Design a protein around this ligand. Structure first.
Ligand SMILES: O=c1ccn([C@H]2C[C@H](O)[C@@H](CNC(c3ccccc3)(c3ccccc3)c3ccccc3)O2)c(=O)[nH]1
Ligand SMILES: O=c1ccn([C@H]2C[C@H](O)[C@@H](CNC(c3ccccc3)(c3ccccc3)c3ccccc3)O2)c(=O)[nH]1
Ligand SMILES: O=c1ccn([C@H]2C[C@H](O)[C@@H](CNC(c3ccccc3)(c3ccccc3)c3ccccc3)O2)c(=O)[nH]1
Lengths: 131, 145, 143
């Protein structure tokens, strides 16, 4: 699967320029309140491209995709609130992690953290480019 | 993917006789107790149909499908207990959202809330039609009585 | 999709010598501390084989670790929601379990909290194998 990632600032641009899931960065440092849900914005828009398939309903196409937590989230108190995000074919907005902080204390996330990852429905290796 | 949905009452049939995720309705008002897991019955049974694929094991078929939370559940204190529901190919039971209330007060869900959605393993667009039975079995809602 | 599983002990092998999800066993009795997350080792390694596709004849493939429906009736939740096991991976399979309760939680050998699933949702078969490949982490090769 092929991703077109529009980075939304220059600082993020330099993150991405500088295997069935594609990691995303935590873009700005942030304190997560205790016992909370926080919509962390990821500083990108994306589209996923695949070959057309024939499907039961009653060239390359625009496809839907998935935001999975990274295994390593399990070592933090943070959980993805909506379990696995579903990002529809038509979505053109910023890509956001819904993160629950399950701890009684605040949690500091920092630019450079990869908590989350993009994945294809079919689990096929991922490729991307900027746009 | 194409779903065939059996509505378990006229009320639910009305809701449905009126996208990569097909949203499902909360079908009865209900209170979830604080700090609880509640099995919320969604008033439907369903069969998913896809084109026959060739697969490594060593036309139009029944297929497995997925039950996902909605994005917007994020804003509530409710979480899907089993992360993502896996519904096997010939499952004929009622569809159920196992919902954790993570908060310490009650949570009132309401007829027409949409917490949860059905999704194909391929992430392809979903259709559905309403049907009276899934098969001839009493669990499919079919056959004699 | 077809799985080859290496059982890391004879005990584990006996349980596996004795449908779109393949249930995996709790392999040893364990107490999980209250309000914690525990990396529970499942005593197996696995590889998944499917038909080569074409993206944008038989291939080694990535796969999914799902909670079982019945996990819902316990206080135990999957930390990472759904675990993604990459095609390359040769380590022991681990379930990261959040004990959401105030009390210790006892899991027993032969409990089944978690299951393996295909990215396609297709029916799963499996066999037991002594190695995944020739590497040491794959448990194969000289030694
Ligand atoms: O994990 C995901 C899942 C979906 N999406 C998508 C494509 C979806 O339509 C869209 C859903 N917007 C919200 C939102 C909507 C309704 C109510 C509350 C929040 C959202 C919810 C959860 C996670 C991410 C985003 C949202 C809107 C505005 C500000 C914050 C959050 O983003 C993500 O970007 N990440
Ligand atoms: O999210 C899901 C996932 C699966 N299913 C399916 C197809 C699955 O085999 C089957 C599993 N029924 C139970 C259950 C089984 C064993 C132990 C405890 C509960 C269930 C569990 C979690 C969520 C929903 C349903 C269930 C059965 C009877 C009464 C309540 C709950 O339903 C759902 O309907 N929704
Ligand atoms: O649910 C899953 C998901 C992935 N994996 C795989 C394939 C992955 O690369 C790899 C990730 N190991 C850890 C880990 C990774 C990074 C940082 C800290 C821990 C992990 C994380 C979540 C769940 C299970 C395992 C891990 C390694 C050693 C000891 C404990 C935890 O295991 C699982 O076995 N189960």
């Amino acid at each position: 699967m092929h991703l077109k990632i529009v980075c939304l600032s220059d600082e993020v641009r330099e993150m991405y320029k500088n295997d069935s899931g594609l990691d995303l960065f935590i873009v700005k440092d942030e304190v997560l309140k205790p016992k909370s849900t926080t919509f962390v914005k990821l500083g990108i828009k994306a589209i996923a491209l695949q070959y057309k398939s024939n499907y039961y309903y009653k060239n390359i196409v625009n496809t839907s995709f998935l935001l999975f937590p990274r295994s390593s989230i399990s070592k933090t108190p943070l959980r993805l609130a909506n379990s696995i995000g579903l990002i529809d074919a038509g979505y053109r907005g910023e890509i956001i992690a819904a993160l629950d902080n399950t701890s009684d204390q605040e949690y500091h996330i920092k630019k450079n953290d990869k908590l989350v990852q993009l994945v294809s429905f079919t689990g096929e290796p991922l490729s991307f480019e900027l746009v």
